[PDB]
Amino acid sequence: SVLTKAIVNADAEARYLSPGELDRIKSFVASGERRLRIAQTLTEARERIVKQAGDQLFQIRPDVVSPGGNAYGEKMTALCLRDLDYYLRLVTYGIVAGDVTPIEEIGIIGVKEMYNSLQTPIPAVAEGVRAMKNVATSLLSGDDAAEAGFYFDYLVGAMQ
Amino acid sequence: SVLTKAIVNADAEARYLSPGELDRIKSFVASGERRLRIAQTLTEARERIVKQAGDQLFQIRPDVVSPGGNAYGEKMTALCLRDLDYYLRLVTYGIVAGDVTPIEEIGIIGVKEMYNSLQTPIPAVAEGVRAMKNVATSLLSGDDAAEAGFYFDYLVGAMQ
Amino acid sequence: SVLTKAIVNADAEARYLSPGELDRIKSFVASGERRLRIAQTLTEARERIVKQAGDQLFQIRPDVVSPGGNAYGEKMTALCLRDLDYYLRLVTYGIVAGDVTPIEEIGIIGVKEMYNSLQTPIPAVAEGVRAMKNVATSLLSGDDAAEAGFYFDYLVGAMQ
Amino acid sequence: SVLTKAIVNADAEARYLSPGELDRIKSFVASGERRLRIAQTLTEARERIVKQAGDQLFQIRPDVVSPGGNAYGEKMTALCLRDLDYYLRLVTYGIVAGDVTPIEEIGIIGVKEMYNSLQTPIPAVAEGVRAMKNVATSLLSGDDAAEAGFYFDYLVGAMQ
Amino acid sequence: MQDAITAVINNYDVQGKYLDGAALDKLKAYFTTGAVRVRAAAVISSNATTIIKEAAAKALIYSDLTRPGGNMYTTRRYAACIRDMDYFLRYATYAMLAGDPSILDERVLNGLKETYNSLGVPIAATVGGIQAMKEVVGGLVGPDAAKEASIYFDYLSSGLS
Amino acid sequence: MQDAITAVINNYDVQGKYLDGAALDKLKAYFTTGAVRVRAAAVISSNATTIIKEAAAKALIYSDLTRPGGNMYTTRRYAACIRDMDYFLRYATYAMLAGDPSILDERVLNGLKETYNSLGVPIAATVGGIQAMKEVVGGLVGPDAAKEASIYFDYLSSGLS
Amino acid sequence: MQDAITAVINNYDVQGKYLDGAALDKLKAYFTTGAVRVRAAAVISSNATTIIKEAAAKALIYSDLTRPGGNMYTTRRYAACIRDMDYFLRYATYAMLAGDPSILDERVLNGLKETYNSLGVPIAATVGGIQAMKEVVGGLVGPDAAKEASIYFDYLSSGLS
Amino acid sequence: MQDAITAVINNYDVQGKYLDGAALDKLKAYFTTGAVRVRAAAVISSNATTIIKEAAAKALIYSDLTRPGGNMYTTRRYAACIRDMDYFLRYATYAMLAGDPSILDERVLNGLKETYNSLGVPIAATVGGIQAMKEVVGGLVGPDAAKEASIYFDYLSSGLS
Amino acid sequence: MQDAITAVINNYDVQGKYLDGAALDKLKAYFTTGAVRVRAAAVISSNATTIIKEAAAKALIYSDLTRPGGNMYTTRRYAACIRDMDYFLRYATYAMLAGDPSILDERVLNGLKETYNSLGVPIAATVGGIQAMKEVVGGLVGPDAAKEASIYFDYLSSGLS
Amino acid sequence: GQSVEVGVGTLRRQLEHIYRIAPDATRSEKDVAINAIYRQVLDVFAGI
Amino acid sequence: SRYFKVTACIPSLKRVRTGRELQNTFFTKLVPYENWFTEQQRIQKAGGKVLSVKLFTGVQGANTGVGA
Amino acid sequence: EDIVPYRRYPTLPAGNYRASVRVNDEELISQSWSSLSPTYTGYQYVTR
Numbered sequence A, B, C, D: 001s002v003l004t005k006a007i008v009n010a011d012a013e014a015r016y017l018s019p020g021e022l023d024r025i026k027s028f029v030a031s032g033e034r035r036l037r038i039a040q041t042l043t044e045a046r047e048r049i050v051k052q053a054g055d056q057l058f059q060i061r062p063d064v065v066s067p068g069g070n071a072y073g074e075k076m077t078a079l080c081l082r083d084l085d086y087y088l089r090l091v092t093y094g095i096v097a098g099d100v101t102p103i104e105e106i107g108i109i110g111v112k113e114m115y116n117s118l119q120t121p122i123p124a125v126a127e128g129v130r131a132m133k134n135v136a137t138s139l140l141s142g143d144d145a146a147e148a149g150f151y152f153d154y155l156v157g158a159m160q
Numbered sequence E, F, G, H, I: 001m002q003d004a005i006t007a008v009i010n011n012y013d014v015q016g017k018y019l020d021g022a023a024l025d026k027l028k029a030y031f032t033t034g035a036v037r038v039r040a041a042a043v044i045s046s047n048a049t050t051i052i053k054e055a056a057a058k059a060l061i062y063s064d065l066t067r068p069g070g071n072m073y074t075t076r077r078y079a080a081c082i083r084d085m086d087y088f089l090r091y092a093t094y095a096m097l098a099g100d101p102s103i104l105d106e107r108v109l110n111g112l113k114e115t116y117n118s119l120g121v122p123i124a125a126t127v128g129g130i131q132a133m134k135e136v137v138g139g140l141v142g143p144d145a146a147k148e149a150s151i152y153f154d155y156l157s158s159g160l161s
Numbered sequence J: 001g002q003s004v005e006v007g008v009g010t011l012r013r014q015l016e017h018i019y020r021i022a023p024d025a026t027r028s029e030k031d032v033a034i035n036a037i038y039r040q041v042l043d044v045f046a047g048i
Numbered sequence K: 001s002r003y004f005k006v007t008a009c010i011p012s013l014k015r016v017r018t019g020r021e022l023q024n025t026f027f028t029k030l031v032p033y034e035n036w037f038t039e040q041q042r043i044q045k046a047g048g049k050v051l052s053v054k055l056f057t058g059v060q061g062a063n064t065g066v067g068a
Numbered sequence L: 001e002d003i004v005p006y007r008r009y010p011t012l013p014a015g016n017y018r019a020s021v022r023v024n025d026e027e028l029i030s031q032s033w034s035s036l037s038p039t040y041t042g043y044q045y046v047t048r
């Protein structure tokens, strides 16, 4: 989280937390209630977001649901939907944590070898994440929607 | 400033800025005019805070203005008051910058070696700075007083 | 000592002793009886140097035995005298050793942190050791005194 | 051996064997029976080769079997002959291996300090190895003579 | 290491679960405790040397530890002991900020007892100094953060002991 | 390196002056344009590889540079050029975020002209690729930060040329 | 490490013996199967990623290991497991080429059991995966090198178990 | 480096000559002044920080060097300049003990000039400080070692200028 | 480590005692034998390789150690053995010069027994060789330093065994 | 007058970091520390 | 091809370093045979303690396939 | 043992400061390692 990042940066120089690294903690604790509300709101609409994002992803890239596609078949599409649910959970984790830090260890480092050895389209996963971002921003206020879209764009660059 | 500390980490890790860095920059930039108004009062009371700080410092320990003291003599006392004015200026710089980069690069690195060469009591200088903190906090609203007290606290901690 | 440091570079280079190291050790063992007589005279007289050094140091800087000074208390001045006794002993050890490494590993490296924690005037301690040097050389012959003063002003230099 | 060298390089670069390494392995396995025949011939002629090499070495350098010679005397000469037999065994080992790795680990590294401690002439050992090579090539076909002489010249260079 | 938020996130990720109200109240508690920790941390930063100068006086110095034959004897050992003491103070501050002793376990207690046994350091004396700083910090910070500060010093003392 | 705030603070430190109305006006001028810089930076970070792809396709590739004997010929040189492109983009993002060209002056432009002259790199092609990523950046970021992002790309192109 | 030739050479050099008929027979026995080892190694190198993919599909994935709470859970742990499997494949190929499990003992099995115990790695699942890779390799290589490939996979599985 | 003795020894070894009357005369000339060099070196070692402080007071501080815009200004530059003065004093002591400016050329003078030009250090002010420190050292040592101590300081000043 | 002088100094510094008559007598006893120690060390340094050569000829070589199956067989292992012999000789010379086995304990025997156990080196053969150079050094040095030289070789043999 | 940057930079001490590895301190910090090793030894000034 | 598994405790007795230095003092590490000599001898030249060693990788017979 | 190396710019060796500042952070790496595809340097332009 932001606290972990600041503590790591301070410990690396063997000093105490400067004032420049305390106002950020104050801002983080101030925005914590809004971040928790955003994460709970995203968690309430988890199934609708996943289904709608999957529909948009399939419309945009029908090749994946084609015979030569990684997600060809009912169970292969269910696995894609479960992966989208995993990434939505990771996004809500990042939003509550305030820093993206856990998401790196959870699902972006090694994700290239994930989808390479599973032969899955990483750009298709990116499009699915973008559809999830659209569905999420459709159910939030402007500042909450922008705050969630920051982490969604972070994932879209992270599997890039 | 906050920008320098948020950019040096990104340059060290060879990556674009993380969302925690972005929204910490938003706390910093949103608090900008308030930071300016906080620093303006201390500049208005520049030569008025230093005089009261000197009296409290000399009341707490008068031996520095004693014949065996480092500040004995009118010009020696004037030099000490000028150093206190220097540190007040650095405190205003740090308050407007939002971090401690200017204060650190101007007046805390090598300060121990230089004051040891001059044989000046560093613990005495710390109390002199704390008197400035009290005088400054007497002239500000509570939240702004705490905000400036964070930088005075950092100076006192780094001085010892 | 001499054999220790020479053996240090000898083992660093993985070789036997050079002729210069050998004749240097030869001169060292040649000067041994004079060194022993030096240290013997000081350890024999050890107490008068301690008390006269304390008196001279307090005369030069009475602020240490002033109310805001580090040496108020009979037991608190006893600690300063015991420190002087310690440093006189280390001077005798260095005199018999033929350089200064036991002195450094006993009371030189870390001594600045030592006295900075206690907020004791390091130049005042150096003044005390210097005043110790004069009353020490007062009880020695012309050539004995210079040899003792070499280690005494070594301690004076190392304290600053 | 060639297999050992190829596997070591492949593991060091963290990859499978290169086409060149595969081709050299194929060539070595093709030449294996010829190498076995050459080694069998040298093993069968091990004693006469050692005797003749000792004879040429003694004719070339009588000083070694002179009073100021390392191999002066019957048992000092027998030790030199046993060393020549050891080198013949290692030469056969290298010829069957296809490289010089066993040869090295067995007698070439440390041999300089070996004959320095024993005060034995390394150039004289090289000359004995050369007369040994002449005797060995006297009992082999031209291609096999060249193949054995490559290892013999490797040994001659190693004693240098 | 891991703060409260990261610990909760990791514990829920290990089940693969979205965050619920039970973890939400725990996060709310830390968000309520945020300001007092920040205010308490700066005070310790300002009075770090002063805090050390009293715990050492009340627990270590003026005893056989500081005399010849003591572990704290000689300037090198005294400087090392005070540097260790500052290490404990700073990492206790980090633990009190992060709301978890994970960093204390990761960066201080790991191998410290074995190194101290190898070097002859008095574990009882170190625990006494840690408790002395705990008393001093509890006095300085006030009722608001005294317990929170004290629990990590107790954690360090228990880990060493 | 320095940003706008540290630049003004240092510029008054060198004169030994307390910060006044002009300095605070410069500071508030930096603060008011804050959010556009981060939104440009976040969009740029999300669209980095697309920017490099579009810049290469519209400024370098499908030419004699990629054909044999050219500079960009061979996979090694192509990877080197794309890495340099990404480097320039990232450091221009840093300069835009900091509001200062000093980061580019120290960590990018220093010796690059002479090194490219020694290695045979096409400076005109480099400037064209820089302008290409500047165009794609102005397109992506929108009206909020397109101009601000454009100034530092122009700075890099001018420093190289 | 050591191959068959090096093993014979060291077993004779420890006795200080010239090579005799028995050692010649062992050397000839190794030489008679050189080409089949080369072709099997080439096939394995050409199909390394495919063998790992089908081995993972048959033994590891679609289970609790890839779910939360599984050792294989999360992309980092998954890539660690598959990188270990590729290590197993490459070192099995090395052992098959050299005709000796000395390299397998030296660079793979040494401490791997204790490492997996400390990390929580499922030894049974790893054995199942390596056995699946052995089956796939035996299918791919053909009759000429099936047993030669399978003996070193069984050696690795026995060392792990 | 080399002293007078080593310089004569090398100057005779280059001709392959045994020591003659002239070499013995030079050696005797150096030997006759050994004690004064040791006394001056011990005095300088004892008064090292005091000499630096008075040199700074007479030559550097209370000027534009110590105000905003001076090279001495700011704590880091103050510490750097005093460390430079300490280096000069130590190497001057080495030169006086060795009776040869070869150590000054090898370990002090090379690189220092253009290093100061690149850094912006005022060479004239440094030379003036070195000369004032020379005056203080000559005052402390006495007539016996005054000129022999002064000559190496003039060597340093001439090498800088 | 420590010599006789430093050992006495530390043994009194730990007790907080000045140098008394007993310490002066111990120091005088060490001082009276200084020249003979220097002579023995110079003789051993001048005759280093001869001592190791004769010790090897008397205790190690012409045995099963130098033949196949031996630990000292092969040029590399023989080099290791004679390098160890030379190190034992030089450290014994240092111990005899310093009048204390502290250097032998700190820089020779620390972990050497377990290292030889792990490597397979013969402890009894090494002890016999060490006794061999002990005999040779005792023969070379003469009555003056024979016992003092021999005591540290005995110390090395006792520590190894 | 000469400012802070006119001295020996102000960027070379900020730009230098000390990485330990901290054996039980998370894959992200471990990867950053390892990437620093590459950027130091085998230049890789992109850092990856 | 031989890697010792060694464990040492090096006490710093010259500087009193102010930052970290725990892993630098107490550490267990694999070291190759080629450099273990200099590593051990540096350890004992720094007043260190060689608590434990292991052979780990190589064979104790040696003299072939060893000096790679 | 346990920290990654970094740029230093030493001071003590009397010229090592300027040598270090020149060798790193003032001069980069020329002379690309491979000798297979030399650049003919005649095409600096990408006009189309």
Ligand SMILES: *CC[C@H]1/C(=C/c2[nH]c(/C=C3N=C(/C=C4\NC(=O)C(CC)=C4C)C(C)=C\3CCC(=O)O)c(CCC(=O)O)c2C)NC(=O)[C@@H]1C
Pocket: B064, B069, B070, B071, B076, B077, B079, B080, B081, B083, B084, B086, B087, B106, B107, B118, B120, B121, B122, B124, B125, B128, H061, H062, H063, H066, H073, H074, H075
């Ligand atoms: C509370 C006052 C204490 C005190 C101070 C004291 N200072 C000096 C002399 C100097 N102080 C400075 C200071 C600075 N230079 C910088 O760049 C900065 C950072 C902004 C500072 C703070 C300098 C350079 C000097 C040297 C003189 C000069 O400025 O030209 C003195 C005089 C010492 C002398 O020998 O003349 C004193 C007494 N003394 C005390 O006792 C107080 C604790």
Ligand SMILES: *C[C@@H](*)[C@H]1/C(=C/c2[nH]c(/C=C3N=C(/C=C4\NC(=O)C(CC)=C4C)C(C)=C\3CCC(=O)O)c(CCC(=O)O)c2C)NC(=O)[C@@H]1C
Pocket: A057, A064, A065, A069, A070, A071, A072, A076, A077, A079, A080, A081, A083, A084, A086, A087, A106, A107, A118, A120, A121, A122, A124, A125, A128, G061, G062, G063, G066, G067, G073, G074, G075
């Ligand atoms: C939008 C869906 C895309 C897609 C996906 C797809 N995935 C699989 C199989 C797996 N996916 C995972 C994923 C994860 N494990 C983790 O730890 C994380 C981080 C939280 C993730 C995202 C795993 C482990 C598997 C393997 C099976 C299992 O879960 O046990 C498949 C099936 C592939 C197959 O060969 O059967 C698919 C198709 N496919 C698309 O076309 C979309 C782009």
Ligand SMILES: *C[C@@H](*)[C@H]1/C(=C/c2[nH]c(/C=C3N=C(/C=C4\NC(=O)C(CC)=C4C)C(C)=C\3CCC(=O)O)c(CCC(=O)O)c2C)NC(=O)[C@@H]1C
Pocket: E065, E071, E072, E076, E077, E078, E080, E081, E082, E084, E085, E087, E107, E108, E112, E115, E119, E121, E122, E123, E125, E126, E129, K010, K011, K012, K013, K016, K017, K019, K020, K021, K022, K023, K025
């Ligand atoms: C109150 C002081 C007590 C004491 C301590 C003491 N410690 C040492 C030496 C070391 N202590 C450490 C500690 C740490 N390193 C770390 O990184 C951390 C956590 C971040 C810790 C806690 C280490 C590594 C050493 C060894 C290296 C060094 O000296 O720096 C010593 C010196 C021992 C010696 O002389 O060899 C002392 C004296 N001694 C007391 O009496 C107190 C109880």
Ligand SMILES: *C[C@@H](*)[C@H]1/C(=C/c2[nH]c(/C=C3N=C(/C=C4\NC(=O)C(CC)=C4C)C(C)=C\3CCC(=O)O)c(CCC(=O)O)c2C)NC(=O)[C@@H]1C
Pocket: F060, F065, F071, F072, F077, F078, F080, F081, F082, F084, F085, F087, F107, F108, F109, F112, F115, F119, F121, F122, F123, F125, F126, F129, J045, L028, L029, L030, L031, L032
């Ligand atoms: C669009 C790309 C153009 C191009 C580039 C090109 N560059 C190289 C090689 C190097 N580039 C650098 C760059 C830097 N060093 C630094 O310090 C910085 C800033 C911090 C930069 C940007 C360096 C050091 C090299 C050489 C070492 C290396 O390869 O990493 C090459 C390779 C040339 C060769 O093979 O010799 C190319 C091709 N070429 C084009 O045609 C484009 C216009």
Ligand SMILES: *C[C@@H](*)[C@H]1/C(=C/c2[nH]c(/C=C3N=C(/C=C4\NC(=O)C(CC)=C4C)C(C)=C\3CCC(=O)O)c(CCC(=O)O)c2C)NC(=O)[C@@H]1C
Pocket: I060, I065, I070, I071, I072, I073, I077, I078, I080, I081, I082, I083, I084, I085, I087, I088, I107, I108, I115, I119, I121, I122, I125, I126, I129, K033, K036, K037, K040, K041, K044, K062
């Ligand atoms: C008479 C020779 C006997 C013998 C010895 C032998 N020793 C080794 C290996 C080592 N010896 C050392 C020695 C030292 N460590 C130290 O710190 C110092 C002083 C600085 C010494 C003298 C060490 C560390 C090793 C291991 C690394 C190395 O080999 O250099 C060996 C080699 C064992 C092997 O082949 O692996 C031998 C053979 N062997 C005999 O048969 C004699 C009795």
Ligand SMILES: *[C@H](C)[C@H]1/C(=C/c2[nH]c(/C=C3N=C(/C=C4\NC(=O)C(CC)=C4C)C(C)=C\3CCC(=O)O)c(CCC(=O)O)c2C)NC(=O)[C@@H]1C
Pocket: C057, C064, C070, C071, C076, C077, C079, C080, C081, C083, C084, C086, C087, C106, C107, C118, C120, C121, C124, C125, C128, E061, E062, E063, E066, E067, E072, E073, E074, E075, E078
């Ligand atoms: C005396 C001339 C000056 C002075 C001294 C002073 N010292 C103390 C307290 C201590 N001094 C030591 C010293 C040493 N420990 C060592 O191992 C060595 C090396 C041999 C030394 C020199 C220590 C450890 C202490 C702490 C108490 C203890 O020994 O257990 C004090 C008391 C400080 C206090 O706060 O009570 C004083 C006053 N004070 C002066 O003014 C003189 C210049």
Ligand SMILES: *[C@H](C)[C@H]1/C(=C/c2[nH]c(/C=C3N=C(/C=C4\NC(=O)C(CC)=C4C)C(C)=C\3CCC(=O)O)c(CCC(=O)O)c2C)NC(=O)[C@@H]1C
Pocket: F061, F062, F063, F066, F067, F072, F073, F074, F075, F078
């Ligand atoms: C064909 C079977 C597959 C395929 C290929 C494809 N390539 C490009 C474009 C380029 N390919 C290269 C390649 C090289 N440059 C080199 O120096 C070397 C080493 C000798 C290689 C291999 C380059 C430089 C380009 C860019 C254009 C240019 O050469 O100037 C394309 C076009 C991509 C586009 O966006 O237009 C394609 C399609 N595509 C497939 O699907 C096949 C598997």
Ligand SMILES: *[C@H](C)[C@H]1/C(=C/c2[nH]c(/C=C3N=C(/C=C4\NC(=O)C(CC)=C4C)C(C)=C\3CCC(=O)O)c(CCC(=O)O)c2C)NC(=O)[C@@H]1C
Pocket: G065, G071, G072, G076, G077, G078, G080, G081, G082, G083, G084, G085, G087, G107, G108, G112, G115, G119, G121, G122, G125, G126, G129
């Ligand atoms: C994969 C089939 C199974 C599995 C494995 C797994 N391993 C790790 C971590 C490590 N694996 C190693 C491996 C080796 N050490 C060696 O010396 C060699 C030979 C060169 C090997 C193969 C090591 C050292 C580690 C730790 C360091 C590292 O990660 O690189 C993990 C990750 C554990 C973690 O998250 O910390 C995993 C998952 N897991 C399964 O479920 C499979 C049965």
Ligand SMILES: *[C@H](C)[C@H]1/C(=C/c2[nH]c(/C=C3N=C(/C=C4\NC(=O)C(CC)=C4C)C(C)=C\3CCC(=O)O)c(CCC(=O)O)c2C)NC(=O)[C@@H]1C
Pocket: D064, D065, D069, D070, D071, D072, D076, D077, D079, D080, D081, D083, D084, D086, D087, D106, D107, D118, D120, D121, D122, D124, D125, D128, I061, I062, I063, I066, I067, I073, I074, I075, I078
């Ligand atoms: C012969 C051409 C030259 C020569 C040799 C010579 N050697 C010795 C004694 C020894 N030689 C060895 C050699 C080896 N041991 C090994 O393990 C290997 C690797 C296979 C070799 C080569 C050894 C160990 C000895 C010591 C005795 C023993 O083995 O038990 C001597 C005797 C020296 C003495 O002082 O007695 C001699 C003379 N002398 C010449 O003149 C030739 C040039």
Ligand SMILES: *[C@H](C)[C@H]1/C(=C/c2[nH]c(/C=C3N=C(/C=C4\NC(=O)C(CC)=C4C)C(C)=C\3CCC(=O)O)c(CCC(=O)O)c2C)NC(=O)[C@@H]1C
Pocket: H060, H065, H070, H071, H072, H073, H076, H077, H078, H080, H081, H082, H084, H085, H087, H107, H108, H109, H112, H115, H119, H121, H122, H125, H126, H129, J007, J008, J009, L010, L011, L012, L013, L014, L015, L017
């Ligand atoms: C002091 C009287 C004046 C002054 C000096 C000043 N110097 C530097 C920086 C450096 N000085 C050196 C010098 C040496 N290195 C050597 O090895 C030797 C001989 C053994 C010398 C003399 C070097 C190399 C540097 C650069 C590295 C460093 O800064 O330490 C500074 C500061 C540089 C900076 O801030 O970056 C200063 C201020 N300044 C004055 O005002 C005096 C006139």
